[PDB]
Enzyme design. Structure first.
Site, mmCIF file in Angstrom:
data_model
loop_
_atom_site.group_PDB
_atom_site.id
_atom_site.type_symbol
_atom_site.label_atom_id
_atom_site.label_comp_id
_atom_site.label_asym_id
_atom_site.label_seq_id
_atom_site.Cartn_x
_atom_site.Cartn_y
_atom_site.Cartn_z
ATOM 1 N N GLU A 79 4.242 -4.217 11.817
ATOM 2 C CA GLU A 79 4.779 -3.443 10.654
ATOM 3 C C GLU A 79 5.763 -4.187 9.888
ATOM 4 O O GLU A 79 5.841 -4.028 8.654
ATOM 5 C CB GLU A 79 5.365 -2.138 11.109
ATOM 6 N N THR A 126 7.264 4.422 2.906
ATOM 7 C CA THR A 126 6.962 4.179 4.292
ATOM 8 C C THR A 126 8.280 3.798 4.977
ATOM 9 O O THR A 126 9.030 2.925 4.494
ATOM 10 C CB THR A 126 5.877 3.055 4.393
ATOM 11 O OG1 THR A 126 4.706 3.485 3.691
ATOM 12 C CG2 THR A 126 5.552 2.802 5.848
ATOM 13 N N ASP A 139 0.660 1.059 -1.199
ATOM 14 C CA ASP A 139 -0.603 1.559 -0.648
ATOM 15 C C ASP A 139 -1.036 2.976 -1.110
ATOM 16 O O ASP A 139 -2.060 3.482 -0.671
ATOM 17 C CB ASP A 139 -0.564 1.476 0.897
ATOM 18 C CG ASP A 139 0.472 2.402 1.488
ATOM 19 O OD1 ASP A 139 1.350 2.915 0.698
ATOM 20 O OD2 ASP A 139 0.442 2.586 2.744
HETATM 21 N N1 LIG Z 1 5.760 -14.002 7.324
HETATM 22 C C1 LIG Z 1 4.834 -13.617 6.259
HETATM 23 C C2 LIG Z 1 4.213 -12.258 6.607
HETATM 24 O O1 LIG Z 1 5.239 -11.301 6.814
HETATM 25 C C3 LIG Z 1 3.224 -11.739 5.549
HETATM 26 O O2 LIG Z 1 2.474 -10.703 5.938
HETATM 27 C C4 LIG Z 1 2.801 -9.353 5.620
HETATM 28 O O3 LIG Z 1 3.797 -8.857 6.533
HETATM 29 C C5 LIG Z 1 4.212 -7.524 6.152
HETATM 30 C C6 LIG Z 1 5.436 -7.208 6.989
HETATM 31 O O4 LIG Z 1 5.090 -7.067 8.338
HETATM 32 C C7 LIG Z 1 3.033 -6.541 6.218
HETATM 33 O O5 LIG Z 1 3.449 -5.337 5.766
HETATM 34 C C8 LIG Z 1 3.165 -4.242 6.604
HETATM 35 O O6 LIG Z 1 1.750 -3.968 6.472
HETATM 36 C C9 LIG Z 1 1.253 -2.810 7.237
HETATM 37 C C10 LIG Z 1 -0.239 -2.629 6.947
HETATM 38 O O7 LIG Z 1 -0.472 -2.172 5.587
HETATM 39 C C11 LIG Z 1 2.066 -1.515 6.980
HETATM 40 O O8 LIG Z 1 1.588 -0.555 7.843
HETATM 41 C C12 LIG Z 1 1.352 0.876 7.488
HETATM 42 O O9 LIG Z 1 1.541 1.570 8.706
HETATM 43 C C13 LIG Z 1 1.889 2.939 8.540
HETATM 44 C C14 LIG Z 1 2.285 3.330 9.935
HETATM 45 O O10 LIG Z 1 2.851 4.642 9.955
HETATM 46 C C15 LIG Z 1 0.667 3.760 8.090
HETATM 47 O O11 LIG Z 1 1.088 5.070 7.991
HETATM 48 C C16 LIG Z 1 0.418 6.226 8.523
HETATM 49 O O12 LIG Z 1 -0.740 6.448 7.744
HETATM 50 C C17 LIG Z 1 -1.708 7.257 8.445
HETATM 51 C C18 LIG Z 1 -3.018 7.176 7.656
HETATM 52 O O13 LIG Z 1 -2.721 7.664 6.324
HETATM 53 C C19 LIG Z 1 -1.171 8.696 8.605
HETATM 54 O O14 LIG Z 1 -2.002 9.600 9.216
HETATM 55 C C20 LIG Z 1 -2.185 11.005 8.951
HETATM 56 O O15 LIG Z 1 -1.085 11.766 9.505
HETATM 57 C C21 LIG Z 1 -1.193 13.201 9.318
HETATM 58 C C22 LIG Z 1 -0.030 13.850 10.035
HETATM 59 O O16 LIG Z 1 1.095 13.599 9.188
HETATM 60 C C23 LIG Z 1 -2.551 13.776 9.777
HETATM 61 O O17 LIG Z 1 -2.732 15.108 9.311
HETATM 62 C C24 LIG Z 1 -3.718 12.967 9.223
HETATM 63 O O18 LIG Z 1 -4.939 13.430 9.820
HETATM 64 C C25 LIG Z 1 -3.507 11.499 9.575
HETATM 65 N N2 LIG Z 1 -4.697 10.675 9.269
HETATM 66 C C26 LIG Z 1 0.323 8.695 9.088
HETATM 67 O O19 LIG Z 1 0.993 9.939 8.832
HETATM 68 C C27 LIG Z 1 1.204 7.562 8.517
HETATM 69 N N3 LIG Z 1 2.490 7.477 9.232
HETATM 70 C C28 LIG Z 1 -0.037 3.000 6.960
HETATM 71 O O20 LIG Z 1 -1.381 3.516 6.894
HETATM 72 C C29 LIG Z 1 -0.015 1.431 7.002
HETATM 73 N N4 LIG Z 1 -0.461 0.900 5.708
HETATM 74 C C30 LIG Z 1 3.584 -1.817 6.963
HETATM 75 O O21 LIG Z 1 4.390 -0.691 6.492
HETATM 76 C C31 LIG Z 1 3.959 -3.037 6.101
HETATM 77 N N5 LIG Z 1 5.419 -3.247 6.099
HETATM 78 C C32 LIG Z 1 1.909 -7.058 5.317
HETATM 79 O O22 LIG Z 1 0.730 -6.311 5.511
HETATM 80 C C33 LIG Z 1 1.542 -8.501 5.700
HETATM 81 N N6 LIG Z 1 0.501 -9.113 4.859
HETATM 82 C C34 LIG Z 1 2.155 -12.805 5.329
HETATM 83 C C35 LIG Z 1 1.186 -12.412 4.230
HETATM 84 O O23 LIG Z 1 0.366 -13.545 3.858
HETATM 85 O O24 LIG Z 1 2.833 -14.029 5.007
HETATM 86 C C36 LIG Z 1 3.652 -14.573 6.059
HETATM 87 O O25 LIG Z 1 4.035 -15.908 5.700
#
Ligand SMILES: N[C@@H]1[C@@H](O)[C@H](O[C@@H]2O[C@H](CO)[C@@H](O[C@@H]3O[C@H](CO)[C@@H](O[C@@H]4O[C@H](CO)[C@@H](O[C@@H]5O[C@H](CO)[C@@H](O[C@@H]6O[C@H](CO)[C@@H](O)[C@H](O)[C@H]6N)[C@H](O)[C@H]5N)[C@H](O)[C@H]4N)[C@H](O)[C@H]3N)[C@H](O)[C@H]2N)[C@@H](CO)O[C@H]1O
Length: 236
Positions: free
Chosen positions: A21, A44, A39
């Site tokens: 994350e 988030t 997204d």
């Molecule tokens: N050194 C650098 C690198 O750092 C660089 O890479 C980047 O690094 C970033 C930092 O780590 C990274 O960013 C992270 O990326 C991820 C992936 O996108 C992010 O993750 C998110 O995770 C959330 C977790 O909670 C997700 O949220 C959840 O979503 C689900 C689905 O919608 C929900 O579900 C529902 O819930 C309800 C109940 O409420 C239910 O009724 C429904 O049925 C459910 N289906 C949840 O509620 C919700 N909490 C989210 O989906 C997800 N996107 C994270 O936040 C970022 N910080 C970059 O991705 C990465 N590339 C690289 C790049 O080249 O370079 C290096 O040199």
């Protein structure tokens, strides 16, 4: 029995998820995390990425205000209710971001975040993994799926992903080989990850979880080394 809820395995699980994350193994440093990663989920935040779009950030804030009345976030409940189901920042913004930062200094908010984590994501992962006869690594596979895709029976939620797996391969509880079952589970998940651009990088599975599986590290035991997004991590 070695399960993901043992103190060390749980600590490992938190560092794994914080690497995915927040590109850090320092999971305790992530309670104050808050970012709109563009997204379409709005804000988030926190240890496991609660969102203002998807209901859980609101649920967390309401639970925090139950246990800690008058905390800095409590006044943002009406705005969290209004923006739920959208990625709008209306009624939040700088005062809300500062209130999150302030609250993340308190053991009370960290406890709220731990509780929500455990009720919605971690305890379901572990209980369901144990019912399926999975190891700590298999329980972890479930926990990371719930963190990213959330709870639910829909095909793109944890329940649907698990169902798809079970259709392909017997779980260990029914005599299935664990490696084959987890391969089928990772492959079911892969399909879903790729359907969303913010999730299309599958390195948290491919260069970390599949690596542990290839290594036969079913107890998710340290020392552990992995990569995500091209960056290497280790735990000892
Ligand atoms: N050194 C650098 C690198 O750092 C660089 O890479 C980047 O690094 C970033 C930092 O780590 C990274 O960013 C992270 O990326 C991820 C992936 O996108 C992010 O993750 C998110 O995770 C959330 C977790 O909670 C997700 O949220 C959840 O979503 C689900 C689905 O919608 C929900 O579900 C529902 O819930 C309800 C109940 O409420 C239910 O009724 C429904 O049925 C459910 N289906 C949840 O509620 C919700 N909490 C989210 O989906 C997800 N996107 C994270 O936040 C970022 N910080 C970059 O991705 C990465 N590339 C690289 C790049 O080249 O370079 C290096 O040199």
């Amino acid at each position: 029995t070695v399960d993901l809820d043992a103190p060390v395995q749980k600590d490992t699980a938190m560092s794994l998820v914080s690497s995915f994350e927040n590109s850090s193994t320092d999971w305790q440093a992530q309670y104050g995390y808050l970012e709109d990663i563009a997204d379409g989920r709005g804000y988030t935040g926190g240890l496991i990425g609660f969102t203002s779009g998807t209901g859980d950030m609101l649920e967390l804030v309401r639970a925090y205000s139950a246990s800690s009345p008058g905390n800095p976030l409590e006044q943002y409940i009406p705005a969290l209710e209004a923006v739920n189901g959208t990625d709008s920042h209306a009624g939040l913004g700088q005062g809300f971001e500062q209130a999150w930062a302030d609250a993340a200094e308190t053991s009370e908010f960290r406890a709220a975040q731990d509780a929500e984590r455990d009720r919605v994501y971690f305890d379901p992962a572990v209980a369901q993994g144990k019912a399926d006869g999975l190891s700590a690594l298999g329980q972890f596979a479930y926990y990371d799926t719930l963190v990213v895709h959330g709870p639910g029976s829909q095909r793109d939620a944890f329940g649907g992903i698990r169902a798809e797996a079970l259709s392909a391969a017997l779980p260990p509880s029914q005599g299935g080989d664990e490696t084959e079952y987890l391969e089928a589970f990772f492959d079911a998940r892969n399909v879903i990850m790729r359907e969303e651009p913010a999730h299309a990088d599958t390195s948290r599975i491919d260069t970390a979880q599949r690596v542990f599986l290839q290594n036969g590290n079913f107890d998710l035991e340290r020392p552990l080394t992995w990569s995500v997004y091209g960056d290497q991590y280790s735990l000892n």
